[PDB]
């Protein structure tokens, strides 16, 4: 067990590097901390550029590139070897609260505000080349696995699908009862894992051949309290496992299986808002908002 | 079969099938306000006596009552492991661990000597999160918790000592007396008593 | 705590004499002595004392 | 590079808190 | 004899120096084995050179007898406490009282450094024993709880941290982060005046006037007892070899093997030629860092050096 | 299962089943309001 | 599928033999049975002792949680119209809610009243019911556990 | 001194809104009863309430096992007086002051050594439940108590600042009323309370056992039965209290009568059948 | 009356340590008053010969 | 009664005075306790004992005053409590075994008797104890167990 402290602020976001050896934290404090994994956990970044809070890190399929959405309005793409921003995407009018970049190339970026647009990049363009207006605010986004979708979740309950190509909306899915928190995608491409504000965390079909009724597993024990935050959700690389940030302090995961809960784990003081999967061993990263960072095996 | 005396029990137990109230060895009836602290037997030894001596010690202090403590252990080799000094490593980390204890009281301690050479500096406002044991559909409006702000207030530079600390007080009696393990006492003798 | 001074010096020097013999008295008795008899080998010794400067 | 920060790492316990 | 002692080689006095006008009191040996300290009733501190034995500078500052004298591992510094109700620090570099700790109401008896947190413990007539912050001068902590003088303090860094003996026959075992006795061992008749711990072997020894016994940490059992110096003896210092020195107030000093207890020399050496037969007595004795030569202060006003007959054995039984 | 009821600081991460799982056994008559509430301290649990 | 007469305990204080009702709880005797002959409780101690109550014992574990069966960490209960939580020195299944029942065990100090409402008796103590006491007179905390060990030494399904 | 991190109060004081601000004032005020200084907390405990503040410390709470403002009881919520009679308890805490002081070190002492976080030195001495002090408690809030003080202006007839005035606008308790006089030592030694002394006089009136001078009789009466209570629940009851054997049932009443071998086992029984009686939903009236 | 100290020892025990308390109960026995008589009492019976 | 108080107000603060004053003085004590003791004031003359054990717990004429005063005043649960504690904390003070016995002897009570013998026995005592604990069996004939 290892124990990150050091942000002066709320942590809302934390990624593993895809190679495993380090890890990204950011939140309320607007820097971005890089830390080794292995040896005594040490640091060896501050990030700077941001002059809002920092809402969601993810990192390229390689790791050279990491992407921070913040509520500053722009969108940080730094260099992870330099630490230099390499560009500012400045083109959202509200706070971004979410980003995605694509699992293919090309170095496609995808963006949801609470301008209620949703606004796809190219980062060797400086302007927006497509925007889907959507009716009220964003809260998360990713791509699917082909790099040619837009999935939404927003404050309106449903779960939106775009296609980049038509330049429509595609279909949609039904069931939540309150505002989509947080989507993420498996390593595989099939299966959605979404959270929201009615206390339920589902898996769906996102293949193109589902049934009509998407919602394969509900899984639930989560809680979202009156601070109304973006608790984030993780696939395990393998699938089997689901994680999901909880406002009741304690740190679950799922079996994908058999539904059951496998941990629980007590010990943050604060809201978890994201919890993260190492990619090869069996650590567990969750992101709180009492300051700290706890770091674990599990078996 | 009913019994009714205690003759009946024998080797005693109450029986279940037998629907009328037993009380073998007369245990189960309400007893009196009783001061006695229980006669506590160890797991296969004599009777724990020792339970007086640790009157008002804990129970992980240690405190020598049996007779065989007095008994000399042979140890014959120096060298054996188990009388080996403990640690080099640990020895940094207790090391640690009391510095971190002294330097603190140190601190307090020198915090005294200079008093007025700046004003403090307090903002840690911090929330703690409270369950009130006595819980009830009233009492909490509904709740089953309730959540707290603290905020230490401003202490005013100028603001003399508010009261008398110099009253002494009769100080209180010590910790409870140890078991004198002495050798008996050997035979003085009427001739030396005299030179 | 107050210090030993000037005009303190001989007035203590004697106390801790005093107090040193005490200490030996207790240790040097057989263990079955009459637990009495102490404040009588000091008067010896201020005795021996008195002897000493009177020659 | 971007400076090392303040952040440091150490060896902790949980402790589960009552109930 | 169920035991075999290990042979060790006898000791014989060689240097007998002499220069102070009181008792010897204390006696402490520089880390470096270049001099050594003592203090006396003479009210002055000697630094005496180990090795020719010459008179290197003599210290004056206090006002009574010095009772105990340690010169500092980690920090050039002398502390030294007296029956002035003063513990003080020399600073070695300048030769002059830097700090001096008040806080005792009575005389300090003796006085040793924890080695590895910088911290002074000092013993008192008045029942207490205090704990001092070199840098600060503070007093941390004020063991209360004898009922009488505290003879003689010894510090490690492994639990128990701090050890005192006294003249009420208990010794306290005290938790230096609480300040509060742990063990209390009543066996000794009679004034517990020397305490020594092993320097490999987690063990230590007191003396008692009726008898020495070996003890055990941390809960301070009972291992042995060691008997036949029958005397009031003063202090008790043990070589990692496993000698054992018991120097008695009637000046008779045996040489022990500490794993068996075995008796194999008993040195009873003469006084100073001006001096009176009831003169004899040994205060301080301590071993050098070589661990080569015995250092002991005596009760004639002299100090006497011994070292080992480097002959092959014929005296082992 | 195998973690003590009486228990702080655990330095390993149990499982779900081992550390939610019941304590067994009937409950004494023996204890008021205030004394069967998981208290810290006289009142009640602060954290 | 064997029926073995009284079972001995064989705890650190003495011995305390236990009778079986056959007639009316077979199943949870055969379980007792069995586990004390495989020596499934030779170990196990006296968790939790409260005074002028119970004393719950019988876990590998030690805690109060453990305890599996030989059916698998569950089998119904055996609620029977007959036995009724009466004196001190019956011998019970202990239980941690319906139709669950483990290899907990608890002997009883006193009439109860609310207890076989939800519990199931299968047996009393009938050798050394004085030790019982003194197992009754043993140091407790606010958890109540022991200071010592107050451990079944061996169990013995003889006859 | 006591340097404690949070107040030992309870619900009624705490106040009606779960969200609550509070500010920790390190030795700002004497103990008013040990006069020991100690950490105060004050908060707002509702909307147009007293701004109230802890006025013991907490070993002098910790001692009688009372909320540190209103001196209250933390498990009952009655006043301290009512709870060790009804328990046939008293403190042997000294009650002149320098005896006080000596007093107070040796629980320091205590506390400091043990545990400490806990009552049972003092509550183990009466642990039992009592069904008076049960039926007296407060089952909910009394945020009366919490009201603004009076305003004194106004008494005399000329209250300036007008209708702004946080301080109540309505009559005094008359002085005659013995209920005035109250002092904070007497409520927290239990002396000459007399808010305990209206509980305790109303708790007697409360009805009893009177039928047993019939000391040859044996035979109970249970009324109120309905057609929904089987003989064998009326039995298990009747059986945890001690040895009988007669039951009959009058239908047309809906009673029973049932014999103990012994009256004495009968008024045994009695103690439990009041009403606290319930069997089936059904609570029952018992009768000679 | 104007001091801090000396009738406190008339209105309880004054520094009232309890006996220790142990293996058997002893809060059922309890001791006669004092026969006060005060017709024959004098200051010197008290104090004895 | 303002007499009776203003004689003890007068009497004990003489006796706490010179306990504050000499308070290793033993002897001070006693003579406070026992003037408790003739004013038959028990529940006070027991406060002085404890709190005089307090100072010197090692000194054996205290125990005894204190449970003497208790075995007069018939109160045989308090003056048990009292040697219980005494051989406790001092085992090698042989007279305390003796007088425990004594009580027990005179009650008749042979079987708690032997208790407290063979617990004496369990620390090795001095040949002259073990002849006593061999007559006390003489006394009442039972030769086979004298024998063992």
Redesign the interface.
């Known amino acids: 067990i290892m124990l990150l402290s050091g942000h002066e602020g709320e942590v809302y976001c934390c990624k593993f590097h895809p190679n495993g050896s380090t890890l990204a934290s950011a939140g309320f404090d607007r820097l971005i901390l890089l830390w080794n994994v292995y040896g005594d956990c040490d640091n060896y970044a501050t990030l700077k550029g941001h002059s809002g809070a920092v809402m969601e890190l993810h990192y390229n399929t390689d790791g050279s590139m990491l992407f921070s959405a913040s509520t500053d309005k722009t969108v940080a793409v730094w260099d992870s070897e330099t630490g230099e921003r390499v560009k500012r995407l400045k083109g959202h009018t509200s706070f971004v609260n979410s980003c995605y970049p694509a699992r293919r190339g090309p170095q496609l970026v995808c963006t949801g505000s609470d301008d209620g647009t949703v606004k796809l990049w190219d980062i060797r363009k400086k302007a927006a080349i497509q925007t889907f207006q959507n009716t009220y605010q964003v809260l998360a986004v990713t791509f699917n696995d082909t790099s040619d979708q837009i999935i939404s979740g927003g404050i309106d309950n449903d779960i939106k699908v775009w296609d980049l190509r038509q330049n429509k909306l595609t279909y949609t899915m039904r069931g939540h009862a309150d505002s989509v928190t947080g989507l993420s995608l498996s390593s595989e491409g099939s299966y959605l894992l979404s959270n929201a504000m009615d206390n339920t965390v589902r898996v769906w079909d996102v293949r193109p051949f589902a049934p009509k009724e998407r919602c394969v597993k509900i899984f639930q024990g989560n809680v979202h309290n009156f601070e109304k935050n973006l608790l984030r959700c993780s696939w395990s690389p393998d699938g089997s496992k689901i994680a999901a940030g909880s406002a009741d302090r304690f740190v679950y995961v799922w079996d994908t299986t058999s539904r059951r809960i496998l941990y629980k784990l007590p010990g943050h003081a604060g809201s978890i808002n994201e919890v993260a999967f190492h990619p090869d061993e069996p650590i567990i990263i969750s992101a709180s908002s009492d300051k700290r960072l706890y770091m674990g095996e599990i078996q | 079969w009913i019994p009714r005396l205690l003759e009946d029990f024998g080797d005693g137990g109450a029986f279940p099938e037998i629907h009328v109230a037993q009380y073998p060895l007369d245990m189960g009836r309400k007893k009196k306000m009783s001061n006695a602290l229980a006669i506590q037997v160890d797991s296969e030894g004599k009777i724990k006596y020792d339970a007086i001596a640790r009157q008002g010690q804990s129970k992980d202090?240690?405190?020598?009552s049996k007779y065989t403590?007095?008994?000399?252990?042979?140890?014959?080799?120096?060298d054996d492991p188990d009388?080996?000094?403990?640690?080099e490593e640990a020895?940094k980390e207790?090391?640690e661990?009391?510095?971190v204890?002294?330097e603190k009281?140190?601190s307090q301690?020198?915090a005294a000597?200079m008093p007025v050479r700046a004003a403090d500096k307090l903002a840690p406002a911090q929330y703690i999160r409270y369950t009130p044991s006595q819980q009830g559909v009233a009492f909490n409006s509904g709740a089953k918790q309730r959540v707290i702000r603290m905020v230490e207030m401003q202490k005013d530079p100028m603001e003399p000592p508010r009261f008398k600390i110099n009253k002494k007080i009769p100080r209180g009696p010590?910790?409870p007396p140890?078991?004198?393990?002495?050798?008996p006492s050997r035979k003085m003798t009427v001739k030396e008593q005299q030179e | 705590?107050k210090?030993?001074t000037k005009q303190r010096?001989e007035s203590?020097?004697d106390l801790?004499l005093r107090?040193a013999v005490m200490?030996?008295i207790?240790?040097?008795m057989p263990?079955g002595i009459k637990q009495n008899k102490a404040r009588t080998i000091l008067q010896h010794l201020s005795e021996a004392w008195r002897c000493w400067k009177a020659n | 590079g971007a400076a090392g920060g303040p952040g440091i790492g150490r060896a902790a316990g949980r402790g589960i808190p009552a109930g | 004899t169920?035991?075999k002692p290990q042979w060790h080689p006898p000791w014989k006095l060689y240097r007998v120096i002499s220069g102070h006008l009181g008792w010897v009191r204390c006696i402490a040996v520089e880390p470096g084995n270049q001099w050594f300290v003592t203090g006396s009733a003479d009210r002055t501190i000697k630094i005496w050179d180990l090795a020719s034995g010459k008179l290197k500078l003599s210290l004056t500052g206090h006002?009574?007898?010095v009772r105990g004298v340690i010169v500092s591992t980690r920090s050039p510094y002398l502390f030294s406490c007296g029956?002035?109700?003063?513990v003080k620090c020399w600073d070695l570099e300048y030769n002059k009282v830097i700090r001096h700790y008040?806080?005792?109401?009575s005389?300090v008896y003796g006085l040793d450094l924890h080695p590895?947190?910088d911290?002074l413990v000092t013993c008192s007539?008045d029942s207490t024993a205090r704990i001092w912050?070199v840098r600060?001068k503070?007093?941390?902590h004020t063991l209360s709880?004898h009922?009488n003088?505290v003879a003689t303090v010894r510090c490690q860094?492994?639990?128990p941290?701090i050890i005192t003996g006294s003249?009420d026959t208990?010794i306290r075992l005290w938790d230096?982060?609480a300040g509060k006795?742990?063990?209390?061992?009543?066996?000794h008749?009679?004034?517990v005046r020397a305490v020594v711990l092993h320097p490999?072997?987690?063990?230590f020894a007191s003396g008692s006037?009726?008898n020495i016994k070996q003890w055990?940490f941390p809960?301070?059992?009972?291992?042995?007892?060691l008997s036949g110096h029958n005397a009031?003896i003063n202090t008790l210092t043990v070589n990692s070899d496993?000698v054992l020195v018991s120097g008695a107030?009637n000046g008779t000093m045996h040489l022990w093997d500490?794993?068996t207890g075995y008796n194999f020399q008993r040195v009873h050496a003469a006084v100073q030629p001006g001096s009176l037969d009831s003169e004899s007595g040994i205060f301080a004795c301590a071993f050098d860092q070589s661990e080569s030569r015995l250092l002991t202060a005596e009760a004639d006003k002299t100090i006497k050096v011994y070292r080992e007959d480097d002959t092959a054995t014929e005296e082992t039984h | 299962v195998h973690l003590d009821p009486a228990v702080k600081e655990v330095q390993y991460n149990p499982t779900y089943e081992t550390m939610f799982a019941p304590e067994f056994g009937p409950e004494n008559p023996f204890r008021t309001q205030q004394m069967a509430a998981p208290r810290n301290m006289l009142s009640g649990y602060a954290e | 599928s064997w029926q073995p007469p009284n079972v001995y305990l064989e705890t650190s204080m003495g011995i305390i033999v236990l009778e079986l009702y056959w007639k009316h709880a077979p199943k949870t005797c055969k379980n007792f049975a069995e586990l004390a002959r495989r020596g499934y409780y030779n170990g196990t101690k006296f968790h939790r002792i409260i005074k002028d109550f119970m004393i719950q014992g019988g876990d590998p574990t030690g805690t109060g949680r453990g305890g599996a069966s030989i059916y698998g960490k569950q089998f119904e209960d055996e609620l029977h119209p007959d036995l009724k939580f009466t004196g001190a020195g019956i011998l019970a299944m202990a239980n941690a809610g319906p139709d669950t029942n483990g290899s907990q065990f608890f002997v009883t100090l006193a009439p109860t009243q609310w207890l076989d409402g939800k519990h199931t008796i299968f047996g009393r103590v009938c050798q050394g019911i004085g030790m019982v006491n003194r197992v009754g007179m043993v140091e407790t905390n606010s958890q109540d556990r022991p200071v010592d060990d107050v451990k079944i030494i061996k169990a013995y399904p003889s006859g | 001194w006591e340097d404690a991190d949070f107040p030992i109060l309870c619900q009624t004081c705490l106040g009606e809104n779960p969200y609550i601000r509070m500010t920790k004032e390190k030795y700002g005020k004497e103990c008013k009863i040990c006069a020991r200084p100690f950490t105060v907390f004050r908060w707002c405990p509702g909307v147009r309430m007293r701004f109230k503040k802890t006025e013991v410390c907490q070993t002098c709470s910790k001692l009688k096992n009372v909320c540190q403002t209103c001196l209250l009881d933390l498990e009952y919520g009655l006043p301290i007086q009512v709870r060790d009679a009804g328990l046939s308890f008293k403190d042997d805490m000294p009650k002149s002051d320098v005896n006080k002081e000596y007093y107070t070190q040796n629980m320091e002492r205590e506390i400091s050594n043990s545990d400490g976080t806990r009552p049972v030195g003092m509550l183990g001495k009466a642990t039992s439940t009592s069904d008076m002090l049960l039926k007296l408690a407060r089952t909910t809030p009394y945020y009366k108590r919490n009201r603004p003080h009076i305003c004194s202006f106004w008494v005399k007839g000329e209250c300036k600042r007008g209708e702004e005035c946080p301080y109540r606008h309505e009559k005094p308790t008359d002085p005659d009323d013995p209920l005035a006089d109250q002092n904070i030592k007497d409520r927290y030694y239990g002396i000459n309370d007399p808010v305990a002394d209206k509980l305790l006089k109303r708790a007697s009136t409360m009805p009893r056992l009177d039928p047993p001078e019939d000391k040859t009789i044996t035979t109970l009466y249970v009324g109120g039965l309905g057609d929904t209570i089987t003989e064998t629940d009326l039995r298990n009851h009747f059986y945890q209290f001690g040895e009988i054997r007669t039951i009959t049932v009058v239908q047309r009443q809906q009673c029973a009568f049932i014999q103990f071998a012994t009256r004495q086992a009968a008024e045994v029984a009695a103690e439990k059948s009041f009403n606290k009686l319930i069997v089936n939903g059904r609570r029952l009236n018992v009768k000679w | 009356r104007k001091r801090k100290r000396g009738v406190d020892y008339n209105a309880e025990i004054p520094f009232e340590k309890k006996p220790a308390l142990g293996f058997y109960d002893t809060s059922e026995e309890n001791y006669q008053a004092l026969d006060a008589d005060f017709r024959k009492l004098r200051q010197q019976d008290l104090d004895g010969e | 009664e303002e007499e009776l108080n203003d004689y003890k107000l007068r009497k004990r603060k003489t006796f706490e005075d010179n306990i504050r004053k000499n308070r290793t003085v033993i002897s001070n004590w006693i003579k406070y306790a026992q003037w408790e003791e003739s004013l038959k004031e028990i529940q006070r003359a027991r406060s002085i004992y404890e709190r005089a054990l307090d100072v010197?717990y090692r000194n054996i004429t205290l125990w005894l005053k204190y449970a003497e005063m208790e075995m007069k005043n018939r109160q045989v649960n308090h003056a048990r409590n009292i040697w219980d504690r005494a051989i406790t904390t001092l085992p090698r003070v042989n007279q305390f075994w003796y007088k425990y016995t004594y009580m027990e002897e005179m009650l008749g009570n042979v079987a708690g008797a032997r208790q407290v013998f063979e617990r004496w026995m369990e620390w090795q005592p001095e040949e002259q104890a073990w002849h006593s604990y061999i007559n006390f069996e003489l006394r009442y004939k039972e030769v086979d167990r004298a024998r063992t």
Request: aromatic share 4%.
């Open positions: 202090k240690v405190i020598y403590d007095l008994v000399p252990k042979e140890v014959m080799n120096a009388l080996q000094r403990p640690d020895i207790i090391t661990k009391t510095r204890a002294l009281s140190v301690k020198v000597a010590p910790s140890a078991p004198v393990m002495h050798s | 705590a210090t030993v010096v203590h020097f801790e107090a200490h030996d207790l240790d040097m263990e | 169920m035991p006002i009574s007898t029956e002035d109700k003063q008040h806080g005792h109401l005389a590895t947190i911290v007539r912050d600060t503070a007093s941390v709880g009922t003088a860094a492994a639990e941290q003249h208990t230096l982060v006795t742990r063990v209390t061992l009543t066996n008749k009679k004034s490999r072997h987690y063990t006037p009726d055990k809960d301070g059992s009972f291992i042995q007892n009031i496993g107030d500490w794993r | 010197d």
